[PDB]
Design a protein around this ligand. Sequence first.
Ligand code: ATP
Ligand code: ATP
Ligand code: ATP
Ligand code: MG
Ligand code: MG
Ligand code: MG
Lengths: 110, 110, 110
Amino acid sequence: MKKIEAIIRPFKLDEVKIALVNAGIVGMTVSEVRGFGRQKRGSEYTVEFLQKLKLEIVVEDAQVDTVIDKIVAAARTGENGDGKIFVSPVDQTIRIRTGEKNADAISAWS
Amino acid sequence: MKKIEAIIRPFKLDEVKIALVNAGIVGMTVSEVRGFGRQKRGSEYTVEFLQKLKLEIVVEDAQVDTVIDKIVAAARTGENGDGKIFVSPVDQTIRIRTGEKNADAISAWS
Amino acid sequence: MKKIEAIIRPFKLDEVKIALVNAGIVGMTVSEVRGFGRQKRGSEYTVEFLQKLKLEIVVEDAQVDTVIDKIVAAARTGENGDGKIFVSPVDQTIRIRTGEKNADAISAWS
Ligand SMILES: Nc1ncnc2c1ncn2[C@@H]1O[C@H](COP(=O)(O)OP(=O)(O)OP(=O)(O)O)[C@@H](O)[C@H]1O
Ligand SMILES: Nc1ncnc2c1ncn2[C@@H]1O[C@H](COP(=O)(O)OP(=O)(O)OP(=O)(O)O)[C@@H](O)[C@H]1O
Ligand SMILES: Nc1ncnc2c1ncn2[C@@H]1O[C@H](COP(=O)(O)OP(=O)(O)OP(=O)(O)O)[C@@H](O)[C@H]1O
Ligand SMILES: [Mg+2]
Ligand SMILES: [Mg+2]
Ligand SMILES: [Mg+2]
């Protein structure tokens, strides 16, 4: 199991969501965040942090590469600021209503 | 050390908090998020993302199973949408005020 | 690659940002959160969760100790509530605009 955390442009949420759902994703969490990247000592009057959305998608390992490709293709515009993806390990997943775990708590297959 | 990330119904925060504190938890972070799960191509007029709270609780490994059980018991209602828990590894924890690490930065025992 | 998650006092954002940028950091994400720590059964009228900012900084492993030290030095005040840092593994990083990975998606060196 892995967590895919994708930081995207806010306007891209629905395009990314549709891509993910059509690829078989059946869960995801979205956070409002602000950030900076490489910015191709500070100011008291201006703000370097830009609004983004943080998508968190917990998947099985066999899904990761597909998910990444779907996100990148849907989120990209070609302009600096398109976002960044971080993949990290997940040890266990539990569905609260039922107590089901791992693939049972993630998968479209029940 | 592990991070327990629990996505719960907003109204359940205080019931879950009380359960955790009574089980000996002495730290946690809460985020406002939106999400979807299995939803037992999109719309321009309606919103599939539902408001939830993201609880992040960093614990020692011996605490994990207890914490999960306390969260599930307090958060559950039986209706779809009760939430989901993800456990992930933590390599190091540091308390900023003192520089203490790991168990010293987590534990109720000082 | 590691994720450094630093929970800090809101007023400290710019001091911490400046320290990180001067140490060579060229990316970070900030979240509004609420939390509690050790609090040196609840109430219906009062709120134990305190506003904090969650900084997420994905770095290469050689940067971690420097980053931690910069954060702690900039964020500390000496009063309870100064914050907490969690370090966790990252398996892969992808820049959305270009598809670059790992160090190429993190580093100041291109
Ligand atoms: N190393 C990082 N750690 C944590 N968050 C980051 C990091 N780099 C970028 N981010 C997040 O991703 C968002 C988008 O970054 P952005 O797309 O500008 O990256 P970039 O490296 O500057 O690439 P580009 O050249 O395409 O702009 C940032 O606003 C921030 O929220
Ligand atoms: N795989 C996932 N990855 C990331 N976040 C998820 C995932 N699945 C669910 N979530 C988060 O958990 C919240 C609650 O999900 P929910 O309880 O509806 O899960 P479910 O799998 O549909 O189970 P149920 O049948 O009990 O509804 C979602 O709104 C989202 O924030
Ligand atoms: N174990 C934990 N898991 C998750 N978040 C935590 C944990 N401990 C603290 N936090 C987060 O860090 C914030 C700051 O905690 P705080 O600095 O009060 O920690 P503390 O352990 O009480 O240390 P101090 O004695 O310096 O107050 C909390 O409000 C919460 O957001
Ligand atoms: Mg950029
Ligand atoms: Mg559901
Ligand atoms: Mg405290």
